[PDB]
């Protein structure tokens, strides 16, 4: 098949990650990596109570740097923010040792499709 | 555009209809008209506490007959079940006087797409 | 942890099951077991082109698809319809061997939360603020 | 009654707005106003092909898209970015005249429930049984 990620599921995953980052008072802010980190970043911010989310784009103590998935950009993040808490929603075998924390494990060979790249449209019957 | 109906929204509509049919003890059962009435029927049954949903297919006192939308089949239902409480989730101007109750009003010219006929798939960017 | 099942995901499972039930030309009808099997039965009917779904509260069975949401007794269903193709969406271990086909394997101790018993509502922030 | 907004519907609105913002070749970037505007900004960036979304907690503006979720003060945004194209998803009456473009009209007294503040959870049957 194909690893489909719906909004509801992404939200559930993000909420689990949020609870794992408590207490919220220990964080100064959240840095989301465009574009995949934007939505998960906004969710964490809403769950933790952080009013503002900063954004970056690749080619910091107390800050959380978030990205949707880590397959291989992790390096650039580590160089720019050495003291940041790098977290991701999904993680493959290769990138697993790069993030400080993640939520769901997906096989290296899985084609994962994110909710922002999909939509609800008419799907013809199989018959 | 096109009138898109998602699962969550259909469920909300059904729940509103369910609350309008209280008390639940006054109903003997629920008759769903295949196929559009199946899902809404199962939802009502779950909300009212009716363990079994009967099904019919067109070419009853205490029973609720449900269909997804009434555009023009309403007649056949009235003949087969003269004492049934005919209800629908959606209703257009033409069929509005035929049902005993409904939830949402949609223009006669609106192309309504139901959740069971759709799905979450990849949608190319507009750019 | 409970196995949350959203409408979208259930539909994916149902469609996948429909694919296995092809071609549709062989099936004479669908018998959805109330009350959970009704929704997946409706989805199957749609995907297979079957215009009518019959329901039973519990005709030899040949050509009919008997569907229920989960399995873990099916013995009664098999007794009522011996020659029917009994299928389900989810299935636990002990119940796995009794169905003709299913889609997702669920651990015996896992509590499945079906879409129809849930709803989209306000959820307070974990931090309370 | 509150205006419930689900992820699916929000996305539909966002895409519709994106269509009006075409072609994309004219925009130099997107400035999402925290914290609600960030999600729609991400969707716009995706639809328009804009690789980076900037955020502001509140460069003349020419070529940039300043987006927020709802409007009903925008006066500060207009002051910070005079030559920017201020857009939103929803908009109330009093706030309608201040935005350059929006998608859905919301009555002034309507309480909008955004997707990010909601979640899919168990909902007890109305009949209690």
Curated annotation (Swiss-Prot), chains C, D:
Membrane among keywords: yes
High-level lineage: Bacteria, Pseudomonadati, Pseudomonadota, Gammaproteobacteria, Enterobacterales
Topological category with respect to the lipid bilayer: Peripheral membrane protein
UniProt cofactor(s): Mg(2+)
Subcellular location, record wording: Cell inner membrane
Family statement drawn from the similarity comment of this UniProt entry: Belongs to the purine/pyrimidine phosphoribosyltransferase family. XGPT subfamily.
Subunit structure, as described in the record: Homotetramer.
Binding site for 5-phospho-alpha-D-ribose 1-diphosphate: 35-36, 68-73
Protein name: Xanthine-guanine phosphoribosyltransferase
Assigned keywords, A-Z: Cell inner membrane, Cell membrane, Glycosyltransferase, Magnesium, Membrane, Metal-binding, Purine salvage, Transferase
Keyword Transcription regulation annotated: no
Pfam families for this protein: Pribosyltran
Pathway: Purine metabolism; GMP biosynthesis via salvage pathway; GMP from guanine: step 1/1; Purine metabolism; XMP biosynthesis via salvage pathway; XMP from xanthine: step 1/1
SUPFAM superfamilies: PRTase-like
């Amino acid at each position: 098949e194909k690893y489909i990620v719906t909004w509801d599921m992404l939200q559930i995953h993000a909420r689990k990650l949020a609870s794992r980052l408590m207490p919220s008072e220990q964080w100064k802010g959240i840095i989301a990596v465009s574009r995949g980190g934007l939505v998960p970043g906004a969710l964490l911010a809403r769950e933790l109570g952080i009013r503002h989310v900063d954004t970056v784009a690749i080619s910091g103590e107390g800050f959380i740097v978030i990205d949707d998935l880590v397959d291989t950009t992790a390096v650039a993040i580590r160089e720019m923010y050495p003291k940041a808490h790098f977290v991701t929603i999904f993680a493959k075998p290769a990138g697993r040792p790069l993030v400080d924390d993640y939520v769901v494990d997906i096989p290296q060979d899985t084609w994962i499709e994110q909710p922002w790249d999909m939509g609800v449209v008419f799907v013809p019957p199989i018959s």
